[PDB]
Every structure is written in C-alpha cells, then in structure tokens.
Amino acid sequence: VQQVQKKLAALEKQSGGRLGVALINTADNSQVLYRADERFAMCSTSKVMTAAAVLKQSETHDGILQQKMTIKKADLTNWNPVTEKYVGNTMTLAELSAATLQYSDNTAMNKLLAHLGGPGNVTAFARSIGDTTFRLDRKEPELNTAIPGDERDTTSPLAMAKSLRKLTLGDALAGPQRAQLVDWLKGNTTGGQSIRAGLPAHWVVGDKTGAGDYGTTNDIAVIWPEDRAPLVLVTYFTQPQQDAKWRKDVLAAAAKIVTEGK
C-alpha cells in the first residue's frame, strides 16, 4: 500500500539503476506510480505503437495487411530471426507485424517504418489517440542508443500505460484490429523473464519487451488476473554504464510488488 512505495524505492537502490513504473488497475482506475512522468528510451517497446499505426490503416484500406514487400539481403540488420528466412522473397504486412512484435525482429520494424513513411508518422498516430509524450525519431538499430539525457525515441511510464490501455481495451482501434493486437501481444515469445516472471503462472498476459544500450531493460503489458479486471503495467529500467548488462529480473520483481494481491 504505502509499503509498495518503500519496496519499489528499495528495489531501485539495490539495482543501481533508474526505475520507472506505472500500474493502472482498471477495476477502479487506481494507479501505482514511481517516476511515472520521467522519460525513458522505449527501445523495442516502441514497436507496439508502430504496429498499431498499421492496424489503424487497415480500418480504412481493406486488405492492406495482405500487402507484400520484398526482403533483400541488404535489408538485414543486427537482429533478423524471421526476416532472414525470406531473403529474396516477400512478406505481408501481417507477417512483418507478427515478426516484429513476437520475436522483436529489427528488419521487420524497419520494413513497417518504410511502409508508414518514417517515425514521424508513428509519432503523429500517437498524437491522434491523445498521447502527447510519446515520440519516435529513428529506425533500427539506432533507436536503441538510450543515451542519458537524450529525449529521442522516449516516453514516460504513465503515458505508455494509458496508450496501451487505449489500444488494447479502449476505443483507439476498431474491434477486429484491437483483437489482432491483443493476440499478437499474447503470442510474444521474448517476455519469459520479465513481467511474466513476477506473476502467478496461470494468469493470462500480453506484452512487448525492450532492450538497448546502458542496459536499458523494458516491458509493457496487459494482465488478466483470473476473472478480475485487467491491469495495464509499464516497467522501465535503465543504468549508468553504456555497456551494462540487461536486468530482466528487476522488471519481474517490480511486477510482483505492484500486482501482489490483485
């Protein structure tokens, strides 16, 4: 309760980094905030707003998700778990969206950025749903520099939590698109050691992870605790050393602290 703030404060002190948490309990709209208004480098978590921008398009242009793009060996980047299997072939916007959300494929992200016309467009979309904090400035892999004091490609915990609620539970997207985004998040394969690790095994979760220089370790998610009201949670973490190691365990601990008894 008031002991939640003490635990979070102590968890950050032991971590040696800077922690950001925003929890929204949709049961009564109450919130748990820790540095909720400070900016953090989104890293791969920015892929959710990006994918949602494409889904928004599909609401007007029928069959857009079935539109193809060719994959060239010169498109490959530092992380191509899926795209590298299609070199010299094509991929639909649906496959690219899936590849970037569930495997955090970097080449797939840049493909979606090209389709949309650049990061400025994603930023505009954000603005269209009432988010005045979010901002995307670069593509993969540069957007993961996470340099202290740099505002490029950042956002705040509380603002990313609200936008995720709007996209997955609110009216920012239409029915079909909303469901498709929820299914993609639920199929993520990278969140095993983060938020999920701090929750009871049988709870249902949808999330997107993030990792960048300065050991920036993030994760955003929607959590369905048995038959109760869903919880929207954002855990952002970054460190002092540019080459610091990732701390997925710090997000897991923060998750437990704020969702205990929910």
- The domain containing residue 157 runs over which residues? 1-262
b/e burial code for range 52-87 (CB count within 10 A of at least 16 → b): bbbbbbbeeeeebbebebebeeebebebbbbbeebe
* Number of neighbours of residue 114 by Cβ within 10 angstroms: 12
* Number of neighbours of residue 102 by Cβ within 10 angstroms: 20
Per annotation, catalytic residue among 59, 142, 151, 260: 142
- Distance, in Å, from the CA atom of 30 to the CA atom of 161, rounded to the nearest integer, reads 13
Residue 123 CA to chain centroid, in angstroms? 15
**What is the maximum span of the chain, computed from C-alpha positions, in angstroms?**
57
Total number of domains constituting the chain? 1
Q: What is the side-by-side order of every strand in the sheet holding 216-224? A: 30-34, 18-25, 231-238, 216-224, 204-212
Residue for token pair 């997207």: 173
Residues 75 and 97 sit within 8 Å (Cβ to Cβ): no
- Distance, in Å, from the CA atom of 158 to the CA atom of 40, rounded to the nearest integer, reads 11
Tokens, residue 25: 């309990």
Tokens, residue 119: 């990061």
- Residue 142: active-site member: yes
6: CATH? 3.40.710.10
Identity of the amino acid at 100: T
Per annotation, catalytic residue among 44, 46, 97, 156: 44
Tokens, residue 20: 């950001």
Angle between helices 106-116 and 93-102 (to 10 degrees): 130
Q: For the chain, how big is the Rg over CA atoms in Å?
A: 17
Helical H runs in 92-226?
93-102, 106-116, 119-128, 157-168, 175-186
- Distance, in Å, from the CA atom of 190 to the CA atom of 194, rounded to the nearest integer, reads 9
Tokens, residue 220: 């955003």
- Residue 140: active-site member: no
Identity of the amino acid at 139: K
Residues 203 and 226 sit within 8 Å (Cβ to Cβ): yes
- Distance, in Å, from the CA atom of 129 to the CA atom of 244, rounded to the nearest integer, reads 35
Q: Which of 33, 35, 37 is nearest to 18 (CA)?
A: 35
Residue 27 CA to chain centroid, in angstroms? 22
How far is CA 23 from each of CA 52, 65, 95, 217, rounded to the nearest angstrom? 21, 32, 31, 17
